[model samples]
Target: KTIIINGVQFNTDEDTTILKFARDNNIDISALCFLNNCNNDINKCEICTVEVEGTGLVTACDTLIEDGMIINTNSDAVNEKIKSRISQLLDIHEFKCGPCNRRENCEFLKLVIKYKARASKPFLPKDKTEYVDERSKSLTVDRTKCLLCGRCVNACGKNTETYAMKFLNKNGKTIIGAEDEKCFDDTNCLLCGQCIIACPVAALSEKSHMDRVKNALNAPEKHVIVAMAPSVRASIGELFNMGFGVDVTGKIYTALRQLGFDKIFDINFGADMTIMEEATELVQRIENNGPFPMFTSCCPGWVRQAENYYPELLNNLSSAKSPQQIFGTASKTYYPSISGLDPKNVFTVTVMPCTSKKFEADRPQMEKDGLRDIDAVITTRELAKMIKDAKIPFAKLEDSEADPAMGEYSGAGAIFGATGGVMEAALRSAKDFAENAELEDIEYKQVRGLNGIKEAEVEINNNKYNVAVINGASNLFKFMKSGMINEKQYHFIEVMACHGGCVNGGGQPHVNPKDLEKVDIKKVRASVLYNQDEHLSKRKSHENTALVKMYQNYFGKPGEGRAHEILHFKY
Candidate 1:
């Protein structure tokens, strides 16, 4: 089909919408309600107005580009329509910009500047403050600043399938909030924070641990040690204005050192520890015929989802603690003994690409000897704030190595950031353990990619094993139900609650929806971890010398003694 957009004829698919065609051709069209992969496009905002040849002004999002169609995106009529809609949105929105955490990257603010629009007077009186919901430990909700765009609602409904968020009518006013006035913690909320990244305004966001971390860093008596998650290195560079998927492992260590941490460690080491326990557990289960399909428990969001919705399958989850928890436990117990530091003075902080890690760190089950595994959990965004606040030129900082105590990791540990990484890492170790021989072809191409659900078959010792990898809570729920009905078809299943795994976690730097259209951000970030894996000398978690030495000298072996006590947890 041919469409004349701004006097230039271009070929396009008949079914393609004007918005998509314009975006593909490098034409800019402003929109609030148009979200990629979100099917519930109700055309409520009507901000993407465009002038059509015969149909007059129409929404570009849902309007298809017909043959010989004429469209004007920057017409005066279109600008007037968009401005009027922005004015209406501003009328209800609370104008609290100074304290907003998303003030610098807000879509609402960008649109206002793009259209040269001014804030309208508040619809309600000045004394009437906007409603704020801070009940969720993982996220915050402010109805006053909400654009009512339904992006968060759609994210919960379409992406996570939790239906934890919805719109409510109170006193003739529409507000976005949890369903049926239920508190977020009381509902089926995953605490994944997917809605935080999906939100266009300050309506949804992760609760900040910046203040607590700052206090810990400033305290001279406390020995503050930090652990960086595997996924964090791939995404944190984006906060420093670097390209997506840029590897900043060494730079991250330097930044943490500059931030006043006494020691720095890689959560990849914990991932290596996780793999060591998980693979051994898998072998034991396979030999004993216990729990045919073992589910990965590294993702706290996935663990919570299983606990909340799939109680029947609770026994199927692997007992290995997540990398964050493992690092915390090791830091408090083993690291303290080795470094000559008191357990009480060792304040452990985790830098993660997940908001749920904050919730996970607070879990009572993750504590031992009356001490929490992790003292504090900060997101990748929060780490960036700390660096900027300290006036540290992050990009210009000299690259430095992670502390040797618990910093060494294998390629398998590095890949834990992306979807299917756990399964692939486990398979590499499990194959060698099961067959009693090393396999040179370690890359399981079938399990890797952006697919919501991936299934593969592996043959070990003449026994065929079926494995499944699922990202996104919605897909995980559907797959679990199907597996239950089909008498547990898979022998191993890995579930990551957020889509595209931890690399696209809710706590990572926020990428604008417009930029998302131009790039596969998740894939780009995942590629960084994969590249790290390829370059590393040792690709298998079992090959990590530091972990092996720790097991031999301190923990005895995988799934036994101190290793089990510190590196494993129950759901």
Candidate 2:
């Protein structure tokens, strides 16, 4: 069927909504509740109203395109109709929740700004303003700020498949709340925080730790050290209102220095270290027949999921700690020695794009020098707020260099932020170990990109190296269940809990799926990191000079006794 909208003919399917067809054809149609995939339930938020062929006013999201239909998207009549719809929703809606965390960048807030909405005269919301399931500890859902958009519901149902949260009730009493009011700990919640990002308003936010971080930084005697994860380098700029794939590592490093950190380091350095340990472990597993397939433990979400859901596969997981933990271990020992600061006075804080690191860091086993490996864990969102609270103009801040000794890293380490990056990095070293010769092409395009799971078999010398990479728990479950039950065909595997890898991690930034549908998040962000990799002179983890020096001068060679005791820890 062909539909005419704004003088342009759109060849659309019979059942396809006019809005979808318009969007697909590069026609920009204003909408609030009209999400992609017709999942837009036409209730409560009705901001997508448009003039239909026969129907006077119908939601373009739900209204199907017909064989000779004429739709007017920008007609003054339709604009007025959409304006009236917004006015009505605002009239009854409570906008009193002032300046949410996403206040400046929220899509709904953007819509409210575009329409120039004013609060309704002297009205009270009939919905309850109480918090539900605060025990979840990751996010708190306040019914007051919820616009009943149901974005979180769709995200859970579609993105993660947890379906733990939903919009319940009817009429004016309808509100967004978790099913059975189960705390995230009790429910199937993976604590991915997809809902928090999907929420158009500040209905959901990270359980804050900014104050604690500030307190730690202010301690006069303590040396506050900051480490940024590889994923953070790709995504942290988004929180500062930068575009998706902006590489802000230098700006982030400068910001940390201005924020009064004694040392600023890249977690990718530890990511390089993780590759060393992981590669050696894989080599040992393959040559000595210790374990069948080694799983990369860089992602805490994947680690915790394995612990909680599939504890049986525990042995297959590499004993190497995550890059965050590896950084913590290095900070207490290598960093302190290099900086001439006492390990006791050093307070190590990790800025990660994963919320699960909060739990991972506190693990009793991850300790060095009689101190916890990581002193504190803050998500990317929290760090953004911290920069604001410190009055650091991140965008205006001059790009700065990382500490010369500790911050030097290779492209192999930098790529560790995305899914399959660790496996690819390890392969660079693993292939060399197996073939006793360095491979010329270090870029493992086979495992790269945004695919949920990518597998490949490569022959180096005479050794057939089998590999698999899985991102998102749902995808990992499918990958693992496929052939992992039998003696592993793959020698190495990388798994991350979030779909676009850490670039689109649950804790990176709250990007609504509505916005994600329009933007290629994984492509854009991964491109930035990949571009960083391409330009880098070094592409192998073992080739990192600082890492090699750390091993040779201080910690001994990779997987040595000292490396094992300090750098490596079993989950």
Candidate 3:
């Protein structure tokens, strides 16, 4: 079929919508909830109303383009209709004007402003349906502010496919809720809060822990230690007026010091330790055929999902603890011995992009010497709120340094927060393990990026190695299922529960998913880490002087008995 749209001929299938055809031909078409030609399957947001040659008014997202059809996407009548409808929406809908985090960039806000809308004559209450899913400990859902934009619904259904949540109710009273009113923590939900970012309003938020953290810090009897996740250094600055994905490690260290932390440490240091243990374990497991495919366990969401859905694959998961736990354990163990702080007096806190770190911190294996390795877990978004609540001058705060005793990290350690980062970092060290030679180039760009699933192979010392990287649970499910059924030829796999790894974690700052469709969160955060790696004097984990010194002075070697006793744990 064909149509003349704005005097330009466009070829489109009879079943295709006018808006879609216009979009394909580079014609501008504004839409709110419509995306990827799948908008017809939903009837929630009605923002794509359009006029056909004969039909008076219809949703362009659902209306099919007919032969010889003529549609004016930008006609005055069409504009007025959209504007009037938008006005009505603004009047009836709940817009979080004062408390909204997306005050400047919200699509609804922009549209409301563009149309110069006024409140309705008899203003209606917004979607006041209150819903909570306690199945997941990291996030909560309030249906009141939802515009039924379907971003979170789609993300929950299509991305992770957890299907723990769904949209229900009817007409103006419609809302988002869990499938059966089960608390998120009680359900199969992994506590990965990517769905929070998928929400446009404050309907979803991280479970705040700022007050608890401050309480620990204020106690003079406690020695509070703050450790930052690798991804936080690359992106937390964005919350305080810095550009997305800028490396602000120095500033972060400075901020923690000003916040009254007795010591500041790097989770990247633990990342280096993770690589040393994980890479060696991978080789050992492969050689002994201990597991067909050793899956990375750095992502707690993936760990939870595996424990629930693929319990049989639990054996395939790497036994090494995540960087969060590793750092926490070391802080309570090694730091006390080195810095002379009493183990009982030390209180460890972690600032992570991941909400799952909360669950990871409270796990049974994370305890050492009768103390939980980490006392509390706070997200990057929580950190931002803390700074704001404390009235810290984020923009003017002088650049500061992390404590030297344990905060030191290398480029390889920093990249662990990214998707293919674990595989890349492991390969950087594995190359040495396999060939006993340094690699000329360290970046494994092939497995890096936001692709749903990626794979690569390399031959080291006449031995072929196969690996795969997957981000998001649905993609990970597909990869694992296919490989398991076919006996897929893979020796190692890295899976992150979030869509783009820790950079877009559920607990990160809120951003419009519609806008994020164009923005690459992974690239923004990964580039910062990569750039940091490129400029570092040492790029490989093995080259980190502190790690090398530790191994020589205490552990003796990577696979030494003492290394396993303190730095390693089995799942």
Candidate 4:
């Protein structure tokens, strides 16, 4: 179709909307409700109003490009409508940008600044009001700043398929919140924090643990130990204004040391530990015909989803604890004992890319002998805030390495940040465990992409196994439904609640919605891990000498005796 937009003639698909065509042609148009390419044309907020030659004004998001049609995005009528729409939104919105966590990357704020829109009136004594809901430790729902765009609700329902959040129309005011006004944790909420990524303002966010971490750091009697997750290193650079997929592992280590940690460790080492136990369990299950389709339990959000909605399938989950918890357990037990520090005085903190890790650390089952496995969990974004607060020049810091003893990790561990990473890492070790020999090719490209669900077949020792990797809770549910109605297909399944796995986790970094339209942030972040995996000396989990020594000297083999006690958990 031919269309004239802003005096430029361009060819576009008949089905392409004016907004999409404009965006593709480098035309600037502001919008709040149209997020992630969703057609949320309930037209609640007509911020995308454009001037049409035939029609006075129309929403560019829903208006299709027609042959010989002319559109003016900057027309006086469209400009007035856009400003008026933004002003209306600002009228009801609580303008708390100074204290709001998302002020730096808020789309609403961006649009308002671009359009020079102002609130209808200044706050009055009688208009003082704010709605705060801190029901879940991993997430908060503040209704005062909500734009009623429904992106969070759409993300929770369509992307995650949890439907934990909904738009509630109360007293003629629409607000996004938990369904039926239930607390997020009490409902079927997965604590994945995707809604935070979708939210354009401070309406949704991961509860900050900065104050708690700072307190722990300042305590004289406490030996604070910190570990950074595999995915964290891949995405933390983004928060520091570095390009996407930039590897800042060494810089991260340097920053943590400068921030005053007693000891620093790599969660990649914990990932290696997880792979050891997980692979052994998978082999044992396959040999004994126990739990035909065993599911990986490395993702805390997926674990919670399974527990809440698929309790019957609890037996199918891997007994291995996630890398974060494993690192925590080791920090308290092994590291403390080896370093001659009292376990009571040692505080273990994890820097993870997922908000669910915070909730997972607080789970009762994750604690042992009056000591919690993890004392605190901070996301990548929170760590970035801490860096900024500490006044550290993160980008200019010299490269450093994690502490020895428990800091070393293999490439298999590094790859755990991406989707299908666990499966690929496990297969590398599982093939060796099952066949008693290492394969030349370890990379499983079939399961490496950003697809919602991936399936593949592998053969080890003349035994064929069907494997599946699923990212996003919705895809997992669909895979499960199909398996139940037909034949149980896969022998092993890896599920991550967030799409594209831990690299795109809720706690990692918030990419502006505008920037999101320009690139695949998840894929770029995943590539960082993959590149790291490729250049590492040791690519297989079984080749981790530090973990091997730990097993040989302290604990027995994987999934046995003392190893089972500290590293495994039940739903």
Candidate 3 lDDT, 1-571, residue by residue in tens: 8788877786755577776666667776667776423552565465676667787667777777888777777788878877877776666566657776556456777777876766576344543444433445567665545567777677677668787767777455766766555666666777787667666666677766677798999888999998888888877877787767677878788788878888888888889888887888877875676676888988988988988789887888877778888777778777777778889999999998987788778777678779888888899888887777778887677777777667778888988878898989888887877677887888788988888898888665687778888878889788766765255578889999987788878878765444455567778887888888889887888887887776777667675587777766656
- Per-model TM-score, in order, reads 0.95, 0.89, 0.87, 0.97
- Collision count of model 2: 1
Question: Model 4, stretches more than 4 Å misplaced?
Answer: 123-130, 484-488
Query: What shift in Å separates residue 531 of candidate 3 from its native position after superposition?
Result: 1.6
lDDT of each residue in 192-231, candidate 1, tens digit only? 8888888888878778788778898889888998999988
RMSD of 1: 2.1
The 10 consecutive residues of candidate 3 with the worst lDDT sum are 126-135
Candidate 3 lDDT (Cα, whole model)?
A: 0.76
Instruction: List model 4 lDDT by residue over 99-195, tens digit each.
Output: 7788777788888899999988743234323377776879977777877888887788777788888877767766777777777888888999988
What TM-score does candidate 1 reach?
0.95
**CA error at residue 430 for candidate 4, angstroms:** 1.0
Write the candidate numbers in order of decreasing TM-score: 4, 1, 2, 3
- Point out the higher-scoring one by lDDT: 2 or 4: 4
Off by over 4 Å in 1: 11-13, 39-43, 122-130, 482-488
Better of 1 and 4 by TM-score: 4
In candidate 2, which residue ranges exceed 4 Å CA deviation? 6-15, 24-28, 34-44, 74-98, 116-129, 132-134, 168-179, 239-244, 368-370, 481-488, 510-518
Best by TM-score: 4
Cα miss at 292, model 4 (Å)?
A: 1.1
Residue 534 of candidate 1: its Cα lDDT?
Answer: 98
